[PDB]
Amino acid sequence: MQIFVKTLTGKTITLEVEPSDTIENVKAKIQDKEGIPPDQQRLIFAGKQLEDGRTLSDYNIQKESTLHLVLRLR
Amino acid sequence: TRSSRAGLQFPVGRVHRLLRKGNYAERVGAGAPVYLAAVLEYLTAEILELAGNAARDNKKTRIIPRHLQLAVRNDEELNKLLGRVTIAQGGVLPNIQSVLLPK
Amino acid sequence: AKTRSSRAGLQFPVGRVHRLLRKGNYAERVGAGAPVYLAAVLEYLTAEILELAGNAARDNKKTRIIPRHLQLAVRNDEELNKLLGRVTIAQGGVLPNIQSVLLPK
Amino acid sequence: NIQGITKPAIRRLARRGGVKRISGLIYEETRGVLKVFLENVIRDAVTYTEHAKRKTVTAMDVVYALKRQGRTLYGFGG
Amino acid sequence: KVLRDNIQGITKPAIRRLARRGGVKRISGLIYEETRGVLKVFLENVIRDAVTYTEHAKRKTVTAMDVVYALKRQGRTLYGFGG
Amino acid sequence: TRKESYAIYVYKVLKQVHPDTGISSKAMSIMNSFVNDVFERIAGEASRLAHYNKRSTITSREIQTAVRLLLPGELAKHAVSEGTKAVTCYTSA
Amino acid sequence: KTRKESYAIYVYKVLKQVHPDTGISSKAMSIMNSFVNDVFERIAGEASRLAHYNKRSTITSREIQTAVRLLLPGELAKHAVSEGTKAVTCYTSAK
Amino acid sequence: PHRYRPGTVALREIRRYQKSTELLIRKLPFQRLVREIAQDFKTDLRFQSSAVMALQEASEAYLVALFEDTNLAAIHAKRVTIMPKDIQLARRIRGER
Amino acid sequence: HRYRPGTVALREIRRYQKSTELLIRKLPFQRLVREIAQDFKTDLRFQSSAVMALQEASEAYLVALFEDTNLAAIHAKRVTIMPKDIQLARRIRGERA
DNA sequence: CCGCCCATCAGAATCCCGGTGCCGAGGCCGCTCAATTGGTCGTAGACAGCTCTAGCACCGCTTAAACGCACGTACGCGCTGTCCCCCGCGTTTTAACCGCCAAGGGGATTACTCCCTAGTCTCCAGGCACGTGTCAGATATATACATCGATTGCCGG
DNA sequence: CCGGCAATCGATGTATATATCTGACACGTGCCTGGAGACTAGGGAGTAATCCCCTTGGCGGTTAAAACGCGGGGGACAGCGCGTACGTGCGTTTAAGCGGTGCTAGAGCTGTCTACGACCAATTGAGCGGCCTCGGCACCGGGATTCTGATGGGCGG
């Protein structure tokens, strides 16, 4: 399904990622479509820092979600 | 500060002061303000996340009381918690009984 | 006079009420007249309820008051019913009441 | 001044309540129930104001009264 | 010992007696099951609160004071069993 | 251990009101619960009143306002009269 | 112009944590302040009653935990208990 | 053969049970149900007899009040028989989810 | 042309269930509040916020009452609300004795 | 051959889009007061141990209540007709809302003093635990009265 | 010559009167813990003065909302018919209730000692009040899209 990811520059990107796909897969797809290194990417959903060892379904990410970049929570 | 040690955003010292000057008990333990601040922060985060989603649905970038009302009334646990609370300038959920609809 | 109730001319205890107020986590300080006022109010309410319940007991040709008489006394008074609106009395029962549409014609 | 609560206003309140057809004897009942509710709340608020030795009724007194009656209200300084 | 099927111990005559004390003359045949469900929900809530109260005190026995405190929390004050 | 209750004072009031009627054991328990409940209600209301006005003491004014807020219409008048009479008698003596 | 305290800055920090690009108005801020205050009073009063029942002179994290379990419904209580326990453990570990 | 018409013994029962004060449910079934319900939250639990007594009193009071409201709702619809819809309407208006 | 009965009613239901404005004029409500207050104590003053809060609470109360009244009217196989529905709702809620 | 059901038109009503502007939300700066740190001290509570009470389990016997079945009647529900009363729309009236001005009552702050409350120590008496007698009330039995439903007589159609 | 209405008559259920015994209530006794009395120290609250902010009152306009009336369609209500579900009674079965017995886990109390919370003093930075600036949202005008209801048509009893 298609998710919206927003960067610090206000750019909105559409990602076609399955719910069972891991966060590392999302980072790989973002790098493929944008060139941003996965280690330089920090995605967040529901005010939580996503971990590459989990999947979209682990974070209960549903359709038409919104993700943000860089912001860290600790 | 104590919030920094606890890794929180809400104030621990202020909560401790409010507990000590509220006529609740003779003494207050060291971890009670930390526990209370963590719980308050969690509840605030939940409500704010729902309200922000409601604001995004309306194509708005600012939260108004209507969004808070829509967030609270559409969640079962939040509706149970705030069951006897009136939010000013909130409104109601759109709902029409099926008998009144035209055939 | 020696005790505070006798000075106030009451039956309920003023010293015990003062002690309960001072240790109930209500305020930093407690004034001198607050126990007297509270004791007088409590005594008045007790007297009202007991008078009504004793009348109810006398109606049933009884000498002792049982929870049924207290329930009858409370439920038949408007102000007492308003005050004890969300209170359940054990072994009390209900007021006899049948809707008019259910009676035979 | 109870007649200043006009029939169209009551109809609008009913529309927000989800009501389609309204009988002609509903407006008097609505006025009565509103009067009772206002009487209770204003009595409590004026008691609160009088305890503080003020000649002006503030929003805090109204909020305290409503909380006493069991109807918490958010957004006015509570 | 784990026991089941105890909701059926609330027999139809008992529900009829409760309805008679309530002032009801005629009762439909589908009322008993709904009454059982309502009673089950009420008991579940009260017992949950009372068991929480008992656990906080580090006791293995539920007392009448826990029940009274629970009921007061649910906004149903009860007179007679202490308090 | 000693357990305190209101039984003796309730019995004295009852003998003042009905000088021949008695009382059972469950009725006295109900009376004890009633007295305790009213005590907690009035005390809590007075404490909240003191907190609102930024005061650190509870006086007879707080009790009077609390019984005016809590008790219904005609009960409050007689309760206020009784409390005022008791306070005046206590102060004069 | 006496100083008046509120929860506005902390609520704004939380909001910027959950939704990085989203604002809030003054009325919504007032509603949030009232909500935080209300929940505070409820939990504190429940804990005070719990301490009174068991004849204790102190309020500890056990009282707060039991009050949260008594007041909050269902999954809310579970997540709140987890958050509070994590915060207390983190505070104790650091010194 | 003597026989009463329908509704007579019902009124007699209404009068009889509105003047007594005893409990209307057997004690052993209620005790068993309470223990089974409490088994879900915590095992190896013991109860005082007073606790079960208080639970029974509260439950019976709740049910009697609910039946009064149900009778009112049934009469509002020009009926003398109570149906599950009346119970549902009473619970919904009261505010019980 | 002309719309059939019930159409504009549904339009009004839809449009008033999505707004948040107050549905009562301010001057009449202020006058009513002032006279009700003068029933108790004279020479009393009001903040504007007090009247605003009173209006908000009153409108919320009335809207909830009308929701319950509509439910009661539907229970009796009707689409028109009547004073008996209001009385039944208030009685079941507990406000009416 | 005509009443009932179905496809198709214009016309209000709501929404979306684009340009304009304007006021509130978000960021920056100075200060002061409350939170942090470090040390001391007293006591609230945890922990171990002992005692004895009440909660749990089991067995036997009586009997009242529950359960299953049959029969019949009264109530619930659906249909039909009427009749009236609420809804939708057009015209006229009114008062609400906005803008502006003026005046003064009272709410909020501050300085000062003093008197009411807390804390300490001593003494003693009232309330609680325990024990005992007796009488209000539950129990059993007999009896009188009220009500309910079937039977039958009577005025009238 | 039957029906509806009205007045009897037997059966059943409920309240009332009279011993009878018992278990709970009311009263008497000892003691110990909490309340009363006397005194001291200190801060919370009352009181007076000042200031300015906000509440109250009045006037003018304009315009949208309220008030009034009318025509009509749809909903509320009443009567009628039918059928089935619920009430009343009887015979059979079951388990609740009572009365013992035994046993053990746990609730309740006591002594000790110790880690934790209160209190105090000095320091300092976080949060609050004030000011500015621009962008999200309110506003206005125009076109697009969507129901809604009348109109034409077709069809089958």
Residue numbers in the entry:
A (entry chain K): 1 to 74
B (entry chain C): 16 to 118
C (entry chain G): 14 to 118
D (entry chain F): 25 to 102
E (entry chain B): 20 to 102
F (entry chain H): 29 to 121
G (entry chain D): 28 to 122
H (entry chain A): 38 to 134
Task: List passages from the publication reporting this PDB structure.
The nucleosome is the fundamental organizational unit of chromatin and comprises two copies each of histones H2A, H2B, H3, and H4 wrapped by ∼147 base pairs (bp) of DNA. The nucleosome contains a conserved cluster of negatively charged residues in histones H2A and H2B, known as the nucleosome acidic patch, that is a hotspot for interactions with proteins that regulate transcription, the cell cycle, and the DNA damage response. Monoubiquitination of histones H2B-K120 (H2BK120ub) and H2A-K119 (H2AK119ub) play opposing roles in transcription regulation and chromatin compaction.
The cryoEM dataset revealed two additional distinct ubiquitin positions on the nucleosome surface, denoted H2Bub positions 5 and 6. The global resolution estimates for these EM maps were 2.93 and 3.06 Å, respectively, with a local resolution of ∼2.5 Å for the nucleosome core and ∼5 Å for ubiquitin. The ubiquitin in position 5 lies between previously determined H2Bub positions 2 and 3. The density corresponding to ubiquitin in positions 5 and 6 was sufficiently well-resolved to unambiguously orient the ubiquitin with its beta sheet oriented towards the nucleosome surface. At a probe radius of 5 Å, the occluded surface area between the acidic patch and ubiquitin in H2Bub positions 5 and 6 is 890 Å2 and 1119 Å2, respectively. Importantly, the ubiquitin primarily sampled conformations near the acidic patch and the distance between the ubiquitin and acidic patch largely remained within 1 Å of the starting ubiquitin position. Our cryoEM maps unexpectedly showed ubiquitin positioned on the nucleosome in multiple distinct locations that occlude the nucleosome acidic patch, particularly H2Bub positions 1, 2, and 5.
